Amino acid sequence: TLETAFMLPVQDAQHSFRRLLKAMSEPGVIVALHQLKRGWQPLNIATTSVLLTLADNDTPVWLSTPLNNDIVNQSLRFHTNAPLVSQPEQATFAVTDEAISSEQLNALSTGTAVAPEAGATLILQVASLSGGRMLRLTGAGIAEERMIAPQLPECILHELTERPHPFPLGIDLILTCGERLLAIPRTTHVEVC
Amino acid sequence: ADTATRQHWMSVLAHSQPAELAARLNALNITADYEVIRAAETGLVQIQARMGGTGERFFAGDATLTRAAVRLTDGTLGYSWVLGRDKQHAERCALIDALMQQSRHFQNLSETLIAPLDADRMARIAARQAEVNASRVDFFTMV
């Protein structure tokens, strides 16, 4: 009844982490995580790979209602032993879909000025990474500029462009579509073209 | 009731010296068919102590712990958790734990294995306490 995790947990976790590290250190670069054949429906392959690679008992995980399913919760508990929390403010990893709200987004922990790593990482499942509003990325990880047009909610688009939380506070966004992954850390300057 | 008895015999096996337990088991010539469910694994048990012996918990290091699990032919699960790194001793302890849950073995081994081990340990403890008590400082005697 429970879903299956990596066939080769060590190697697969290492490869997925390297892909995610490439995405985060080079924001806007799309990376494919091929190790997991199928995701934990409704979670996609990339999201499941990220959770299996990073989630454990020390990292509370919050699943949004659209993505919250009994099978998914049991599989996460069995494979990662990550505590499941019902509130976004208690989550080290937040998993949502396009239906995320401005309230849930601002409830996510942003860390503190003395402990900016004490915030949350948002894994947002998007309809596509290509067909959205054109976005220009500049900053660390980007030589001059990068162009990406993911289909993003308006609250996520507003978070990326205005950055209400001053650096070093803020969430690091992970966009997932199928097996493809894109990353935008809190440092990335995002402009709407 | 039964849980207390199981705790008692598990404690006796854990506190037993591996050599004496092995000798006693070989002498008993117990014919039991078991599958090792968990191979004897040596790891660490994290030690929790208390401030002032009674107050808040704090981590006072770790100790080596060996665990083993067996399953008899009838589905009886025997377990063992023993300080140290003796895998064979842990396997024997788990086997005896499984056997003691069977009616045909409980009273027999309770009298031929568990009681003689506990008595021997008690004798060792009493002898050591007799040696140690010679160092007690005598101050006053009631007349």
Add this chain to the structure above:
Amino acid sequence: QPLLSVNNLTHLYAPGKGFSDVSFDLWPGEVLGIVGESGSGKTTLLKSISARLTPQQGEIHYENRSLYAMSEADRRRLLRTEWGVVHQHPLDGLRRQVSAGGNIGERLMATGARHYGDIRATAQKWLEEVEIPANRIDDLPTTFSGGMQQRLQIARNLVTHPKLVFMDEPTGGLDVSVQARLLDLLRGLVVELNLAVVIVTHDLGVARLLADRLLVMKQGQVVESGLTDRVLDDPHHPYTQLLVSSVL
């Protein structure tokens, strides 16, 4: 809008020790002196209004922003770039192990200065403006006299031309000539650069020559307020009358 607005500010260590229910307004280009009997809470009020002490009650707005509602980083930035703070003890606002030039240039570098020669030249100029010789720039403040140290802490908190400067007995330990030289400097900065000053002092002459408005504190309570000339020449509270009479 007032540069600094204080509303019902209160902070008490114990009944009668500190201040309570203190409110006032400060616009650019005017000086607000504070006087009162020793231990009246003037220093506590000055620390509270300079982001150095969280009040138990009341509020402080600076440019339409609550002073203590912002992050600690913003308050530190304000105290680092555009806010001067002269302390009653000169060594509090000085670095003992850092030379006078370094003490003055820390404030310049915090504002973006990155040219060593210009920083040194400005430090020498300001050391001279506060009546300390330039050859002492490389000397540590521990080798300076009390007046020299106080005049170093004034130079350190005025080198960046801050908009708002809080002072606690700035004239203490200064001779009359250098005192007047430091009052003229403050008047020039206020009239030219539109600097705002909140000064705590006991020498009523300094307040009269400098303070545009005056406050009187007693037992932690603000008893009298208004224009400096009106308060000094036409006091109303009995303590103000006693204080003006005590003038030598």
Add this chain to the structure above:
Amino acid sequence: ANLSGYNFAYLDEQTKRMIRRAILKAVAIPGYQVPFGGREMPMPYGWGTGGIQLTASVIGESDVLKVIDQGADDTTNAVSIRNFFKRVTGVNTTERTDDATLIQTRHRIPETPLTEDQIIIFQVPIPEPLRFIEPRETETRTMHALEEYGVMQVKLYEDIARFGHIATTYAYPVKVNGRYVMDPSPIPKFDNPKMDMMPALQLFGAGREKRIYAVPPFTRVESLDFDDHPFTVQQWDEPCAICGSTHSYLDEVVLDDAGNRMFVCSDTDYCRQQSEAK
């Protein structure tokens, strides 16, 4: 392949996962020292445990590992670390910076420019650039948090006043992404410019101090200096005695008690590359 009896890269999966999360947080917060639950390694603390942990957490079967200490692959500790990684991972190793996918380094950035998909892992004794000014972490954590780097500028000003120069010659502080003052590890001032807008990921590991920090590719790294005292790299009056390069960091080798000495490239791979080209 790994045939040592340990888990691949000697780290348990929980420790690897925790270090990986720390690496991602460090990448998202360039220049910030991310605390991590570092474990004791077969190497003593202060002998590269942080770098070993980072490499173990990132390394894979397909990576080509390059280990250099003082710029040389044959250095004692570099040999020990490389042999440990060969034993517990079986990965391919190289002395050529160009052919390396992972570079673990102590005190040198290779002369050969790094490229995309390369990760260079630095071993850091003191992850806190403000430590020698303020020994206490309780103060430096808040100094980082409130971007209060006034103590470093004063230190540089006083160094210039006392000596006419900035006394710091290695582990020279650098501002990262315009915000975080960072220690680049005890690399010489010569190597600091290589950090600016590099096309390779830079990871920094302080195992004993339990910190991890990183610089993403193409990130601004600016050494603290003054306009009239611009950042100047080490210089020698002699070229390398083996390859003749004038652009490499040089180590002084004393040949005898009479004072005869020769200067040779610390980056032995670059020295070989130049010598073969003739």
Add this chain to the structure above:
Amino acid sequence: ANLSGYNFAYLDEQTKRMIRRAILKAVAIPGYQVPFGGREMPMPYGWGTGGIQLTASVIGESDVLKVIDQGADDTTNAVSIRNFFKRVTGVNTTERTDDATLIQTRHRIPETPLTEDQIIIFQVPIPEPLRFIEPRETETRTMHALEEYGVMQVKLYEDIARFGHIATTYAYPVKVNGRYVMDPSPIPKFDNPKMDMMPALQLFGAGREKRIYAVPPFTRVESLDFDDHPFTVQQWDEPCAICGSTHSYLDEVVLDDAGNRMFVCSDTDYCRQQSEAK
């Protein structure tokens, strides 16, 4: 006789001579801590090395040695010291204060008054009475030299203000010969009055701290106090449960977990003397 293979009293003649010179200097300068080149003893530092050295330096074949710890002859360390002295000197030993010529004591002055030609040797952990106020010897040496004992008076005043009493209950400072403030060793306040105008020589030995000081017979020893807070000795609502004395220092012996306790004389010899007399 001595048949242990060591020199009589275990001390070489040079060490004995140096300690003897120190003793004479201390006698001529009452209350002053005389530094001496103390040696490591078979007993650990802090277990009576100074007293052992003093006894070894003064003891002779004809002396009758009494060793007491906490006022009792049978105390563990007292037994060890007495056995060591019996082994390396062979002197006669006694539990009777009256019959003793040399008394080495830890934390008690005997209830039985001392007489002429008796020497009582105290074991001292901290020879400096001002140590707990000023831990540094560099300052206390000058405080002794310039008779600046203002820090002790302030300490007593503050103790009275905070508690209403002087917190010090043992090792209570005493002025000697009107000049030197001295630590009488960790004897209770109960015993301090015995020091005043005593007809016996008092020697104090701090082996670990390398100090020797002395009080000659018939010397004024005045405990520091105030007129309105006069020096008051410890008091108990019960007499000794064995001999019934109300004038002896009492030790509390806990008989059970239920809180039953009995108070008995610490000076076991005095307790025996009273019990036999009935």
Add this chain to the structure above:
Amino acid sequence: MYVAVKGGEKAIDAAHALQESRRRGDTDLPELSVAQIEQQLNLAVDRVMTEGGIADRELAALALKQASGDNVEAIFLLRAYRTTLAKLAVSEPLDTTGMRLERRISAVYKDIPGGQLLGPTYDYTHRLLDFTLLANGEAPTLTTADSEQQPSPHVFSLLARQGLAKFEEDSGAQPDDITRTPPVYPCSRSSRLQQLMRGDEGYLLALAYSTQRGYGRNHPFAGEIRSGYIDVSIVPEELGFAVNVGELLMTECEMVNGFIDPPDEPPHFTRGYGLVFGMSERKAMAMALVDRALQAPEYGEHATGPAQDEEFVLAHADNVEAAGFVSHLKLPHYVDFQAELELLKRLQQEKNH
């Protein structure tokens, strides 16, 4: 000219072989066994267990043999091995009241319920080198008293029943584990005790000695030092009920410390606590003394000695870190030294000019 050659690996291998041969020593002598070290060098084993973090006598003795008797190296070996071991369980909180005593003394009362059990100790021995140990000897025949163990209440339980001291109450607070997260200053008392138990014996002993000498004094008395066998129990998930997995020889030290006069409760003694593996008790006493010293923030004490400086004490207490970082200077540093030299040669040429 000169050509570079490879010498690092073979030099390393030869150095390791030399060290191994020196460890073996003269081959005419039989090689030491780990069992002999465990039995006869038991106090070194106790220190190695306590600081290395594993209460396994055989492993500590093995580390000592491998380290050629170097306590620092053996401790680091044991800690490194700890890193490779899976955590199988967390023990139920130790109950020292159930200790089977080998040694129980109290410095605050002449005699106590259960008595003054000296046990195996070097206390009161005359430290004279025993040259008979140069040759094989015969172990003494031990005197035997009654076998029963008398009720031994904790002396602090006797003090607290009188109101002289406060019971150590459990609020259920989750202990901090510095083995899983790096210490954050100021540290909780649980974290402080955990670090001190792992701390260097000599460093903490020196700090405690300084406190006794006025550098942050806390007026210590040894209220009770208990050494003996304490049972360890775990609640395995496979069963759900407590199982006794064995016993550990441990030493517990409780220190009475200077009384305080709180505004709203009667004045009472403060206290410090120490707990170590094995019989070596000076480590436990130093741990208790430094614990009391580091309790200054709780009691609002004005620090007067380094022993009360929490960061300074704890950041440098672990001899794994300290020994590693001091020894790391042996590593090649010629790149960094060349940088320092490059500057000095210029500041020498600008001064002379």
Add this chain to the structure above:
Amino acid sequence: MYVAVKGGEKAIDAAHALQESRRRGDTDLPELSVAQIEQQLNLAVDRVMTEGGIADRELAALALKQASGDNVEAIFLLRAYRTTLAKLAVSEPLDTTGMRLERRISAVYKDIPGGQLLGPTYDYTHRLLDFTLLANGEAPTLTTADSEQQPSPHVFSLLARQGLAKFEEDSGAQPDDITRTPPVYPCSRSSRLQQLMRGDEGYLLALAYSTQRGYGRNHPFAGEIRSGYIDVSIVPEELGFAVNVGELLMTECEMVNGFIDPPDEPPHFTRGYGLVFGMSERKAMAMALVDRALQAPEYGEHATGPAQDEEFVLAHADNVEAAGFVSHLKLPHYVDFQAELELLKRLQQEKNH
């Protein structure tokens, strides 16, 4: 009623017998020999010689056996024995240039005249518990290079020839001997070095580690660490000429430390010095680092760490004193405790009233 009885002596004797039996351990195992401890636990012997004050390997190993492996107790045993030995002569000043080297490394230059001799060392070993040592093994066959020893000039002599450092000059000053007179603060550098050599390894290592971490930093480099055999010579009065009485295995550490810019001479590196018996070198390195830290008065340095506080460092450095005074709390203290109790009980009554 109750009557007092004698129990002290027999309790002491029984405790000593228990300790002796525990030291012997299981009798089925052969008793350890002092020779085995000297050969195979050589680093513990090195520490015991260095801190106990006698460079006699057999005596230190005997103390370790007698102390059941307790380094503190063994050190105190050796020091106590030292007290019983007549001083027969004072050695001529040691000349480390004549050392026959087992190990010579320099962290400041890649290669030096005479080379980087690693020698017997645990440096660069993977600290993995070697379980093969649980059973008897075979010592490795050592590789043999050329037998000649290359000229090994002190690296500091190479630095001083360039003017980068200053030669350590001898003014003929008579060294202070703290074994004959108690230390007087401030102490001379000779007295400081003598005390540090006798100081606790862990305490000094922690202090040096703190200096590396900014608590009184001195920018250290290991200019040279030399271990080997150095000849000892004396000028007996019976003959009037120097006689070589043997050789001692010793380790010398020289630290380069942060340069200074004196007003009247070119800027130069400062230095620290460490010297220990045997091969254990971390003690020598810590000694050099703390020596440099305590050199602050000479260089007019503003103290920023406890390692620069001379009295605090030295008064608590000797673990003989520190261990003795910490353990002395185990002694009966019920008279003093009764005094503290008598006061506290009165304060409780008055507060309650």
